[PDB]
Design a protein around this ligand. Sequence first.
Ligand SMILES: Cc1ncc(COP(=O)(O)O)c(/C=C/C(O)=C/C[C@H](N)C(=O)O)c1O
Ligand SMILES: Cc1ncc(COP(=O)(O)O)c(/C=C/C(O)=C/C[C@H](N)C(=O)O)c1O
Ligand SMILES: Cc1ncc(COP(=O)(O)O)c(/C=C/C(O)=C/C[C@H](N)C(=O)O)c1O
Ligand SMILES: Cc1ncc(COP(=O)(O)O)c(/C=C/C(O)=C/C[C@H](N)C(=O)O)c1O
Lengths: 404, 404, 404, 404
Amino acid sequence: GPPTSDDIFEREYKYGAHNYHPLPVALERGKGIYLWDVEGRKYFDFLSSYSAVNQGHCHPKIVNALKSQVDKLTLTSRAFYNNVLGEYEEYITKLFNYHKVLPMNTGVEAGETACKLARKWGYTVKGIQKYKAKIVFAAGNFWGRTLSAISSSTDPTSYDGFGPFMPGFDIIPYNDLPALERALQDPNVAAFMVEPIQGEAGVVVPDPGYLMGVRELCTRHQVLFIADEIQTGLARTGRWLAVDYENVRPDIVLLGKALSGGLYPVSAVLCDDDIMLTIKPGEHGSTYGGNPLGCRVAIAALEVLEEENLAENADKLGIILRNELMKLPSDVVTAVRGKGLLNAIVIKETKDWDAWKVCLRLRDNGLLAKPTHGDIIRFAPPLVIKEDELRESIEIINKTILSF
Amino acid sequence: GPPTSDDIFEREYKYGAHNYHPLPVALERGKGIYLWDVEGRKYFDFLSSYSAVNQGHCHPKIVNALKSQVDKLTLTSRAFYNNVLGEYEEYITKLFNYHKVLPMNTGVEAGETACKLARKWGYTVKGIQKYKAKIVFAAGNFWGRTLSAISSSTDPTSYDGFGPFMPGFDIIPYNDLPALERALQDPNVAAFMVEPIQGEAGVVVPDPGYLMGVRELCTRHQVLFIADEIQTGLARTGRWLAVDYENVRPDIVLLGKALSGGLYPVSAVLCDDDIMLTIKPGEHGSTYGGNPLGCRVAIAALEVLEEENLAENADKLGIILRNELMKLPSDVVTAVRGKGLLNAIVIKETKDWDAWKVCLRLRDNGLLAKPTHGDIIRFAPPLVIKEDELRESIEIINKTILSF
Amino acid sequence: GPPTSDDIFEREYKYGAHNYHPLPVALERGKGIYLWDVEGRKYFDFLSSYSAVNQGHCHPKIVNALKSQVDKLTLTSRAFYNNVLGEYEEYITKLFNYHKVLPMNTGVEAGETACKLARKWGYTVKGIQKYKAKIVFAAGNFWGRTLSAISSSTDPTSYDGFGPFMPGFDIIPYNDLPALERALQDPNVAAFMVEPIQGEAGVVVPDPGYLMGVRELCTRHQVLFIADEIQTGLARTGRWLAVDYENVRPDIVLLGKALSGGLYPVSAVLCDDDIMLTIKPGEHGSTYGGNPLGCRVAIAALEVLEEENLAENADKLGIILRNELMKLPSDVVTAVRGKGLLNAIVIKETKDWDAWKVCLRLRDNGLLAKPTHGDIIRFAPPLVIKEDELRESIEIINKTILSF
Amino acid sequence: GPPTSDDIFEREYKYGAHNYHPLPVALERGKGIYLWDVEGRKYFDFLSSYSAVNQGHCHPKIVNALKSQVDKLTLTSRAFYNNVLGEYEEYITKLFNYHKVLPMNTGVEAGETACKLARKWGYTVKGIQKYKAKIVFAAGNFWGRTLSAISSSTDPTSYDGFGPFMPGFDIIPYNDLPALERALQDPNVAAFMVEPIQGEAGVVVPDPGYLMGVRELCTRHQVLFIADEIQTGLARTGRWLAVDYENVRPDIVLLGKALSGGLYPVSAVLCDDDIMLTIKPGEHGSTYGGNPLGCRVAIAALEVLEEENLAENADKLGIILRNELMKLPSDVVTAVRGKGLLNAIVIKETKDWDAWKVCLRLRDNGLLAKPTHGDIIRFAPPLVIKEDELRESIEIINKTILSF
Ligand SMILES: Cc1ncc(COP(=O)(O)O)c(/C=C/C(O)=C/C[C@H](N)C(=O)O)c1O
Ligand SMILES: Cc1ncc(COP(=O)(O)O)c(/C=C/C(O)=C/C[C@H](N)C(=O)O)c1O
Ligand SMILES: Cc1ncc(COP(=O)(O)O)c(/C=C/C(O)=C/C[C@H](N)C(=O)O)c1O
Ligand SMILES: Cc1ncc(COP(=O)(O)O)c(/C=C/C(O)=C/C[C@H](N)C(=O)O)c1O
């Protein structure tokens, strides 16, 4: 017969690498804000696949876009043209107001591209001597798992045992303008890459004005501001871009995850011509980047975001979420943070009570979430959720937390 | 109305990065070995999207697996389990006979994963001091476009302007056993990564015995043999793996491209437990890696190769293709090479006549191919091609080549 | 009676090491451009003993310098002074415009001296920690047969079976500025050694601008540029130094071979005081280095080059040689290369027709040459050759090549 | 007018490397046992250019061989054959009773050749894994100035500032059988290289039985015995080889210096076929190695040694030299050592009295010698010296020593 949840776990343990320790639940179906395991149980998805399913699981318009194109053409490679990519390019460039886009597949690939653009611009336009270009990052950052990405990490779990590391990556504290200004005194700095809110660090929101101050500093020192909006972008924090809260226009914007509604790995690197065109024909690419199938699903996923006004929903509903979460006792729940529907709670962890235990019980009470250390729990349900559904999940969260 | 080819070209020129200089052709449909442009012209695909559509464009079995899964569940993320991953992991591990697989999305991600495993094994099993581990590569190698992949490249178009480069990567000549023997004298070498046939270098085929000598030397010096079969694998050269020609078992095998039949970016890293399990939970991953949608399509993609015996077909037809191409005048076509359906011709390039010009005329005569330098043309049609179709293509190639 | 050519080969086979497989011809006399075998046959010498007899075999002025000095004093050793060395030192240093010269005997000794100068300069002036100094070399280099020289070689015949190898020697492709620039990012690099034209690799001429770019990159990164002109120097390429074609002044210049006209093993290392004086008294030397007999002959050898304007002749006649060689069919002779009178042709080798076979027939037709793999033949006659003699030799080459 | 001794020093100081600090004397002529400076002064040569002029300066027979051959042919290179080399090979190999000879030019080149033979023999015959072969050397050794030669030296002046060093070279004390026996327990050792009497270390004579014990231990443990007789060979110690005193037959014998009588840099490597033939055609060589001019002079140089029974004379006169030297006061001259005409004295050095100062006074009194630290003076006149001349020189030494 059909495998049980336990059969499912055992099979992966035997045949798959052990690079993850997932919360013990086996999903076979997803729709909107819901997930169903193989035993048929129903669950509120409060992780949204890291924002990839902002539009909810299997959104019918994005599904139909995928189904329509797969019968026509799925991959020509960029050795030749296809009819779809240019339409997606004009669309996303006009939506975000940048001259061009460089299509890639995964979040880390957008970051790598952005680092390559930063260096190439650094050498060919800023006049940095090869190869003395530096890129500054903020401590707590997370942009992927390539050798380059773990080389800017301050998390031992990311870099330990994987060295030597990529040179020319400097790290400074996040939410620290004076540190940034100090780093930018070196003219060999080509760029500063930062998340408007750090996702994996535990939904760390920098103080008001941080983003405006980063922009000012980058512009003064002729440094590219690379904003990684792979998790924060596409309506999840209440705007098209988290950077929009302070009216900031980064030099390079990275998008991924919700860009395809979870139907295909699609990522994007947006920037104007003076940066974008430092990379010449033949100097950068990817087998699947810009394929017609991912473009069709991306056009659809962006249209859902716009047409269903999900940014406004996430902003209004996020206020409720945070307001209800702050009612929990301050001796149980230490802090509440986030923007829009990108939130987290910090608990007063003890040797016998932790975030993992809380998520296990949440699971038991029908809500799926993942801990981000011993003391942090993220709450980020799909943006299609309704206030009634949200209030029901808040009750589940309340009941569970108070049940310890 | 509908954009013309010229309109398609222009739109991408304005809104897309110029990292590619494609052959000027605009496709809107693909099926099997054929592609159709927006003007309705029909062409033989002799590029197969860099060997990602080995199964032919839009294979019905693969399309059906995608349509079936997209209605159910596409991405839970690795924070939770999905019912499909394990079924795929057991299938692919038994097919290639390795304990485990680590699922990723793009070719370069598989290579990054292999480098991280090599290093982690190097430090935690072999005993190399952190962080002195080295990874040896062959000149001409191409494993992608991340900062780390271009740091091992000998092609300036890949690395120039993109440094500083990742330390710990050494380069030796390809197809050179004495040179590998010399490099492996350093006890700090953790692995040697190599393609059984170099693709982007110009379909460079090493001499008979090279692979056995690499396996022998790596074993002798306690060095992992990493075979990048992202382009050579999955029946392209006439075998499940190009290393099968010498019956050699690498320590780590990389798969990508045709692993999905061109319908989704799926890549994979296969190896036994002693290497795979050096990476503990939380130390490596990817948002889309191992998602259920990509797994369903990869199972179907692998089934097609098997069920249709595409390896045998590529082997049988590849010899016909090469023997026919060798009949061209040795003063116009300087060399013919390849294995199975992964082939190239070298032309006697002049200032007035080159590979690009030949490919434009080939396009005009109904066959799509892409030059690998001013003198090399790659011929790699989907493996579902039939003998009569191959001979038709051959006539097109002879006609074009002799027309100058 | 006197030994026959065949007795000469047999005797060497029995009593001498088998470290060479020379073209079967036994010479007993040489004068100018010609050589005679023991059977009395006359041959044009188109190898010139690798440039050692640039001045032709047994030039009367050099011979007379030899005879004059051997009646006076031949070797005092460096424990004392000889009256001749200083005169040769002042002469050669003013000729090439460097502060000093360090006299050695063979070409590999001057290379070894240059490596020791570069390391000493690296530690004592550049500040590199002992013993982390690196020297970069170009693939295809040849600078002799010591353990250190074969350690930088990429030719398996030079290094296979002779290791372990000297550490601190790194190799990059020849004629590759991006690769040199990449290598010189390591501040532990003390020098880059390179031949302006690679001799033994098959007369490989780098592209216009390579030397200038080498000079620029070395100066920019505080690395010593060591130019090995042992084969290319002293008028053979059409100038005093092959680097003069680009007005490039290397940090260290190595000379040998023609420096004595073939009458005595004489080599020289030229550089300014900031480099030369890093080596103190008792820290480097050679028993025969700077002996009075070799100095007298070197003074005369250089005087012949200057007095007879051999560089101008080699330039003028080299143009003629290459122009006539290019008239040979492109389906037989694939390439013609060189500068001045250092040239070579590449033939369309088959299993039954090769460079060795061509050189046997050449010998049969009165011209002696050295094949340098299965498809390269070098053409480098003494620089004292006249246009009529050159044209006569060219007809012998035409006759031979066309005769197959 | 002609340069004065002082002008000669000044000129070299300005235009030549400062790699030596010679005794201030400028010679312009040499005949037999004598040398004349530019001021006309006559001196007894008690260094003999480190044994290169064993036959005396400018021996008429060697000079005549030189003059005869320079009118015929001086260098064809090894790309072809010359009629002279084979004649010299048969001559020298029968003289020393070894199958073959490998001709080189300088002493360090023959040592380098012997290391390469030992490694090649080690891997191809002994079975050592590539590249684990070791070569053992004796502390105090001196065999030249290449990077490899200074890597086995225990003299800081030879190696300091010139590293990193050649691996695989191990050092044990000289004249120490227990230490050699201990080193040869490693089966990865391929050879032991040693001087029968250390020259540059200060004429260090090992104890009776050392050579026999070296021979025995090397045979017992399947290790090659390489005897460096470049300074001690060719009659200087009173025998053809210093190893003849113990009837020991080394596996490899190196010769040089006197092999040419000081007229040409000529060196030789002798061994039987099982060793010599481990090196195949194209695997080792030298441009000037085995040239016809050096062979003619080497044949004559050896003939003079044999014909004039110089070994017998050196033996007889060496007894006299040492017996007279031992009459000097023990509180001034601490030791007298040597064999045949290779001798030295050790003096009771103080802060104000040293070997250099003694050698200055010697020069003042008409005898030239080389000090070899602050307390050693070597006495080694040409082997053509007569008893009356020796006794005259001895009085000059007595006079000088006693004069302080
Ligand atoms: C801000 C930001 N920027 C880039 C990335 C990399 O995204 P991708 O996984 O598609 O390469 C991410 C990815 C987050 C992510 O995948 C979290 C967990 C992930 N499964 C892991 O390997 O630990 C991101 O949050
Ligand atoms: C042997 C091998 N290993 C890895 C890769 C990288 O695969 P991916 O493109 O999915 O990152 C490839 C990919 C090659 C490829 O597609 C090169 C051309 C590509 N259009 C580019 O410009 O990057 C490969 O040939
Ligand atoms: C036992 C032995 N074996 C080899 C050699 C090296 O010989 P050559 O200098 O020709 O490379 C020597 C050379 C000794 C010698 O006198 C070298 C002194 C010379 N003036 C110098 O600094 O190199 C030797 O004594
Ligand atoms: C650019 C360059 N630099 C140095 C050397 C070495 O020179 P020598 O042979 O005198 O050590 C060479 C020598 C080349 C050459 O012809 C050596 C051939 C010689 N018959 C052998 O096997 O060693 C050179 O081409």
